[PDB]
Design an enzyme around this catalytic site. Structure first.
Site, PDB file in Angstrom:
ATOM      1  N   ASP A  89      -2.752   9.823   1.090  1.00  0.00           N
ATOM      2  CA  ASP A  89      -1.365   9.415   1.335  1.00  0.00           C
ATOM      3  C   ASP A  89      -0.509  10.651   1.513  1.00  0.00           C
ATOM      4  O   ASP A  89      -0.276  11.389   0.561  1.00  0.00           O
ATOM      5  CB  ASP A  89      -0.874   8.588   0.149  1.00  0.00           C
ATOM      6  CG  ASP A  89       0.487   7.974   0.376  1.00  0.00           C
ATOM      7  OD1 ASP A  89       1.182   8.362   1.340  1.00  0.00           O
ATOM      8  OD2 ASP A  89       0.825   7.074  -0.438  1.00  0.00           O
ATOM      9  N   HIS A 137       2.563  10.631   2.365  1.00  0.00           N
ATOM     10  CA  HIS A 137       3.824  10.337   1.682  1.00  0.00           C
ATOM     11  C   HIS A 137       5.080  10.656   2.485  1.00  0.00           C
ATOM     12  O   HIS A 137       6.112  11.037   1.910  1.00  0.00           O
ATOM     13  CB  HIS A 137       3.882  11.017   0.312  1.00  0.00           C
ATOM     14  CG  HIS A 137       4.592  10.201  -0.718  1.00  0.00           C
ATOM     15  ND1 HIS A 137       5.879  10.458  -1.149  1.00  0.00           N
ATOM     16  CD2 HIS A 137       4.184   9.103  -1.393  1.00  0.00           C
ATOM     17  CE1 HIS A 137       6.216   9.570  -2.071  1.00  0.00           C
ATOM     18  NE2 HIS A 137       5.206   8.735  -2.234  1.00  0.00           N
ATOM     19  N   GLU A 169      -2.567   7.793   5.323  1.00  0.00           N
ATOM     20  CA  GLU A 169      -1.397   6.951   5.099  1.00  0.00           C
ATOM     21  C   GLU A 169      -0.071   7.670   5.259  1.00  0.00           C
ATOM     22  O   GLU A 169       0.172   8.764   4.720  1.00  0.00           O
ATOM     23  CB  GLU A 169      -1.475   6.329   3.703  1.00  0.00           C
ATOM     24  CG  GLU A 169      -0.162   5.705   3.212  1.00  0.00           C
ATOM     25  CD  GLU A 169      -0.326   4.866   1.952  1.00  0.00           C
ATOM     26  OE1 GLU A 169      -1.480   4.716   1.493  1.00  0.00           O
ATOM     27  OE2 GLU A 169       0.691   4.324   1.444  1.00  0.00           O
ATOM     28  N   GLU A 198       4.594   0.684   4.636  1.00  0.00           N
ATOM     29  CA  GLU A 198       5.267   0.319   3.396  1.00  0.00           C
ATOM     30  C   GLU A 198       6.772   0.339   3.521  1.00  0.00           C
ATOM     31  O   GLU A 198       7.465  -0.374   2.795  1.00  0.00           O
ATOM     32  CB  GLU A 198       4.868   1.264   2.282  1.00  0.00           C
ATOM     33  CG  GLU A 198       5.369   2.684   2.451  1.00  0.00           C
ATOM     34  CD  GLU A 198       4.862   3.580   1.347  1.00  0.00           C
ATOM     35  OE1 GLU A 198       3.637   3.776   1.277  1.00  0.00           O
ATOM     36  OE2 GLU A 198       5.686   4.059   0.520  1.00  0.00           O
ATOM     37  N   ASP A 233       4.561  -4.220   1.989  1.00  0.00           N
ATOM     38  CA  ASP A 233       4.610  -4.502   0.556  1.00  0.00           C
ATOM     39  C   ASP A 233       5.260  -5.860   0.348  1.00  0.00           C
ATOM     40  O   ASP A 233       6.380  -6.114   0.814  1.00  0.00           O
ATOM     41  CB  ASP A 233       5.386  -3.387  -0.155  1.00  0.00           C
ATOM     42  CG  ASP A 233       5.289  -3.453  -1.671  1.00  0.00           C
ATOM     43  OD1 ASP A 233       5.439  -4.545  -2.262  1.00  0.00           O
ATOM     44  OD2 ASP A 233       5.102  -2.375  -2.310  1.00  0.00           O
ATOM     45  N   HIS A 285       0.630  -2.520   0.541  1.00  0.00           N
ATOM     46  CA  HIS A 285       1.204  -1.503  -0.342  1.00  0.00           C
ATOM     47  C   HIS A 285       1.510  -2.139  -1.685  1.00  0.00           C
ATOM     48  O   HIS A 285       2.132  -3.199  -1.755  1.00  0.00           O
ATOM     49  CB  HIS A 285       2.483  -0.991   0.299  1.00  0.00           C
ATOM     50  CG  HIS A 285       3.214   0.062  -0.479  1.00  0.00           C
ATOM     51  ND1 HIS A 285       4.389  -0.201  -1.154  1.00  0.00           N
ATOM     52  CD2 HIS A 285       2.972   1.386  -0.624  1.00  0.00           C
ATOM     53  CE1 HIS A 285       4.834   0.927  -1.683  1.00  0.00           C
ATOM     54  NE2 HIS A 285       3.993   1.900  -1.381  1.00  0.00           N
TER      55      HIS A 285
HETATM   56 NA    NA Z   1       2.311   5.276  -0.059  1.00  0.00          NA
END
Ligand code: NA
Ligand SMILES: [Cl-]
Ligand SMILES: [Cl-]
Ligand SMILES: [Cl-]
Ligand SMILES: [Cl-]
Ligand SMILES: [Cl-]
Ligand SMILES: [Cl-]
Ligand SMILES: [Cl-]
Ligand SMILES: [Cl-]
Ligand SMILES: [Cl-]
Ligand SMILES: [Cl-]
Ligand SMILES: [Cl-]
Ligand SMILES: [Cl-]
Ligand SMILES: [Cl-]
Ligand SMILES: [Cl-]
Ligand SMILES: [Cl-]
Ligand SMILES: [Cl-]
Ligand SMILES: [Cl-]
Ligand SMILES: [Cl-]
Ligand SMILES: [Cl-]
Ligand SMILES: [Cl-]
Ligand code: NA
Ligand code: NA
Ligand code: NA
Lengths: 395, 395, 395, 395
Positions: C189, C191, C216, C242, C265, C292
């Site tokens: 991830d 981020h 990700e 997400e 999510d 997510h």
């Molecule tokens: Na994430």
């Protein structure tokens, strides 16, 4: 002459059922056709009965006229079962028309553009390299095959880490190149197993350094556009199309640059009438044709004539009449054998090609009607694999 | 509970045959479904027999699990006959699951998002305006209809100059607006008669000033992309989709902006499982849903539940159980009548809407099994028109 | 039945606050939902109070009817806080409807399409390979995990030369493959740390040879189209989503081929009502779903039911109820631990999967209301890193 | 100087609540801002409390530094409530910085590019033409207005045939042109009522011959791409954007040619910091800006400064401080009146323009803090219309 009878034979091709169709005329001719085996083949005779209502009393030499009538009566695009039935009827009409004119069918298709028809052997499994070598060499000695099609899958693709699945396939192809004759061509059929375009691209690019003859049908068929995405950045020859039905599905595949080689099946798309349209589209797009043909000896004969007449034809899928039963995948040479008997004198390869029979009108094979009466329906179904979580994936 | 029997009824809906399917469980429940009538409906029972092999012993509340299994066993996209059979089986599964949970089917689809379901009357002919007025007013008095669907064609489109064909349709619509109630909605179904996108655009733009509710299916279905070309510069609402089968054919139609309103048929696409996918795609593209439904009262019930739960549903095609037999086109009000009897208590409109039956689990109708045994198969086929040169055009 | 009370609990999930919502009915049922923790969670109760005005007295089995009403009352697309509140209310409605029908929630979503739900462990840091091995093996022994998600970042990305940052990540992944079990899956991830598509592509292609399960969210979310540019020429699986809210943001991501796997999510997008729309779109585009889920045990339960019913679901992000507190990045195994107590009987993995509870209606978990009263709000905020020049970059 | 206090006032603007924010510094200055009224405005103070943690002790003259920090702390794109709060804080920072430098805010935005700011009167209803004339003439006499915005809807759009709905709007606009002064400009706000692009195009083209100043927000906001489809073949000026939040949503609208004029709201998008980015994008695409502003006198002041400095600004939406309460639609001149009192000396039009106050630093208005304490929260909600079938449509 006029069409005046239809005879439908429910028989089999080793472990798969097979519906064979005859159309007879009032001047004593008969044309023959072979339906694809989609699965529920007991549905084919009632479809054929209905379609025959539109053929009774008609001039069979009006081939496209009658085949298009069958399509238009249906109105909805027919897809699998309807087009399988239409395909066999198309075959019957070409055969009748050729027999009426006393010519091989290819003379009704613009004439032969080649002298013989290259075949590859449908092996379909993923045998260890020494066993592959031995089988390839046996097939080469007997029939002259130098091209073969395998499965790339060496493990359950849903039960191992993806990088390891792909590495196993690449290592496998490397081992084949280290072991078998250097001139042999090897294609891989991924069998519409892969969901994601990116995953299909990764596998193709892992196979690419070892020169796959083609990389066949990695993704599912319903989204045509994603095939163009797959092929962008793909380093090997991509083939697909067995699961596509008509000129328009193939046109879209071609428009998106979704394949380098197309694989319509002459028993699936509506016979030669549609196959020729599809091949003409591909030709203008500089795409070759490798007809899909896991079907039987009559289907093979139909393919011989189509292939002989089509400039952009390259190679024909081929299964021996006496030999391996139907299979996909597995790390062996398939043990199950059978003999398909409904054709007396099937086309057999010589030096890796099927040979024309120029002095025989029609398809150039004799049907064994007694054999067809002797062996009837057998139930056959696909295996839909599961993932470890219990979900169903793709056959 | 487990599925433990299938019963297949070959019956009829006036002049068209109709296959009705029951799935029974080991705790005494039954779910019901209706197959589309593509034509050769004697093919449906053997398809159903084959598909049932994958349902026997299974938990019917795993609806998408089982319907997807049927799709994947097929592997090839099924198209007409295969999906018709799958559609009825999908219906049976929703019905069983709803009965198991003691709820109306719409409670399994995210709940009702409307209180009742608007319908339009399928009239399908092109009656002179005074006769149209009288029929519309009769239907309005009895059932509350204020929306109606006609054919636009007032002459043989292949036997007159095209400008005169289009003018006849425009003059006709003008005469209807001069004659019938000002609030009535009138749709026109061009019935996939037109070959050329430009011609379809010309007709649509000639109808447009008189506010067609929608202009339905003018072109053939196989080339999806040409629908986007048609709609560019089209001034009226364009509807199509009855002849499309799945989420991906509809996705392409939506991607090319090929329709303003889509018309999947819940007996054609694989039932609610696929219908909901298709409608969700359309919703994100800001396209409404007007389900295709020239089928019978069980199909109508399935449509009630789907329509009640789907935000972007707009209006439902409807044919009375007792009333006009199947027809397309002609300058009259169809004389042929019939009565469809396989549902005891069919949904009838009140004030132009079908009404929910919230205290009844499942579809909320009772099947008349004695009626189904009383009336069996009847042969039905489409009319494929000819041009004056003897060629076949389009049904 | 009618909704007749809402109860809102301000509690916590280790070091992050968490708003949990109950909707009660006049026949004594309660449904439960979990809000995402965006940050200022004291804003959620007044949002919920306002939204409840539209739910009071309504039939909770009209799930989409009511959730869409909440969306339309808002009129403006709600984004973070508004949709977090709507998400919890959506959960409550599914839970109530399932309890009313005495079924697990997945039976309201088309039924279970898998038997259990694969999870990966949210580890989130970048521990040296021996420490990673030990932690992975511990998680594998206890819960059966074979898939894990790490940070790729081994240095401050703004304080070192970019080529060295990327090399550190590639060397790290290589060291993990040399050290941990060969079957383990490892996702990274990034981020939303990377500004430039080209930089994200360089990092992904440096990780690609070691088979990341997915890569990700490397870029920021606001420009969706640039994701299509990133993915062109990217050799690994790309996941994102997400930070996207609705069917239309996901439609654009899919249209531009901006991801191979999407990660909505269920506490962010408006609950199951929207999650299902998003997943259906992805399915037609041949894109999988990896929800997510850095949220708590109620959110996890909601995810179990959604995941169980969704064909294109692949794997679910998972944090243990008792275990590691929230973290992103760092070259250790996070020391901070906590215990989340608001669910009595949380879903725990067995052999790397969450298991269905088919005999329990609704979500199949019991809430600990005493625990929720015991632990209230805690302030939590993100860390927005700075560059050496004093500017702020991206959290 | 350093920010050292925030004061949040919950007050009202006639029938809608309004949150007004002050930021104070340690050298005795105060800056002011106005939050959009999304609905649940009791959520705004806790959002503001959280955001203030990132502003405490900071240099307010680092405007974009701090506003971007607020955005990045959020990480997820904030949408409605979060950005409303950020917008007011942005306003406070510009106001503080301008007061610190002893200049009007426009001198911090590149200076004034015009001498005064054109406004149109927000009327919002669909009064019969004689009543419209009288109201327009009254507004013209008092304030110099020559531009006005109405609703186009003269009937319930869901309860009448669509062609009749559109004809009623066209007939209405014709009647206005036959009745009111020939120089008056009339815009129509369709209020995101229309689902289908084709329907929005039909209405716009029916209004077009009478020269609407602009045709505002006919469709919903979530699908941006469909706006490009709408505008193709649209003959009138199309405006939208009040429901879009940031530089990237506006970039996509511009890329698809989805509007001729954009209408961001300075209380919705994150204040001037984002508004200027959005306007710069539009300028390069040759698209003008007509800021959305149904908000109050402080918001109006913020708009004056932004508008004065922005080359591609064209006209500003305006509601009188003393006058008509909030309304959309209806065939009258709204009877409900109110007085908004939180600004002592609001900008009032002279000859149809707001006038700069060049000798006053900051916004150039005085806040009435006693008035804000006197009038607190009032509940306000939108009306979501229903269709005759019971479904909800769009507010
Ligand atoms: Na994430
Ligand atoms: Cl078919
Ligand atoms: Cl050889
Ligand atoms: Cl294996
Ligand atoms: Cl031979
Ligand atoms: Cl089929
Ligand atoms: Cl009426
Ligand atoms: Cl005629
Ligand atoms: Cl004529
Ligand atoms: Cl009307
Ligand atoms: Cl009824
Ligand atoms: Cl919000
Ligand atoms: Cl293990
Ligand atoms: Cl560092
Ligand atoms: Cl460095
Ligand atoms: Cl493995
Ligand atoms: Cl558990
Ligand atoms: Cl927010
Ligand atoms: Cl004037
Ligand atoms: Cl009205
Ligand atoms: Cl003033
Ligand atoms: Na194949
Ligand atoms: Na039709
Ligand atoms: Na507006």
């Amino acid at each position: 002459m006029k069409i005046d009878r239809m005879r439908v034979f429910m028989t089999r091709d080793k472990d798969r059922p097979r519906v064979i169709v005859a159309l007879d005329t009032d001047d004593g001719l008969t044309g023959w056709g072979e339906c694809y085996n989609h699965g529920p083949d007991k549905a084919l005779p009632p479809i054929l009965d209905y379609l025959y209502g539109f053929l009774s009393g008609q001039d069979p030499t009006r081939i496209d006229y009658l085949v298009n009538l069958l399509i238009q009566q249906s109105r909805f695009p027919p897809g699998a079962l309807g087009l399988s039935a239409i395909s066999a009827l198309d075959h019957c009409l070409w055969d009748l028309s050729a027999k009426a004119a006393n010519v091989p069918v290819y003379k009704l298709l613009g004439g032969a553009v080649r002298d013989r028809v290259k075949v590859y052997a449908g092996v379909y499994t993923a045998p260890d390299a020494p066993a592959a070598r031995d089988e390839f060499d046996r097939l080469n000695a007997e029939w002259g095959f130098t091209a073969f099609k395998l499965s790339p899958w060496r493990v359950d693709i849903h039960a191992h880490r993806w990088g390891n699945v792909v590495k196993a396939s690449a290592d496998y192809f490397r081992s084949l190149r280290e072991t078998v004759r250097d001139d042999y061509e090897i294609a891989f059929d991924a069998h519409a197993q892969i969901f994601e375009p990116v995953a299909a691209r990764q596998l193709g690019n892992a196979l690419a350094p070892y020169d796959p003859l083609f990389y066949e049908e990695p993704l599912r068929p319903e989204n045509i556009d994603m095939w163009g995405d797959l092929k962008q950045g793909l380093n090997c020859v991509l083939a697909t199309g067995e699961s596509l039905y008509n000129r328009n599905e193939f046109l879209r595949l071609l428009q998106v640059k979704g394949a380098d080689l197309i694989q319509p099946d002459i028993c699936v798309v509506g016979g030669i009438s549609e196959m020729r349209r599809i091949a003409t589209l591909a030709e203008a797009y500089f795409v070759g044709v490798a007809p899909h043909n896991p079907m039987g000896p009559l289907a093979t004969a139909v393919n011989v004539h189509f292939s002989a007449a089509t400039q952009n034809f390259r190679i024909l899928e081929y299964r021996l009449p006496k030999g391996q039963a139907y299979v996909y995948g597995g790390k062996d040479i398939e043990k199950r054998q059978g003999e398909t008997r409904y054709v007396v004198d099937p086309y057999l390869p010589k030096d890796g090609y099927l040979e024309l029979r120029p002095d025989r009108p029609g398809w150039g094979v004799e049907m064994d009607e007694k054999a067809m009466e002797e062996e009837g329906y057998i139930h056959w179904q696909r295996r839909v694999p599961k993932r470890p979580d219990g979900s169903y994936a793709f056959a």
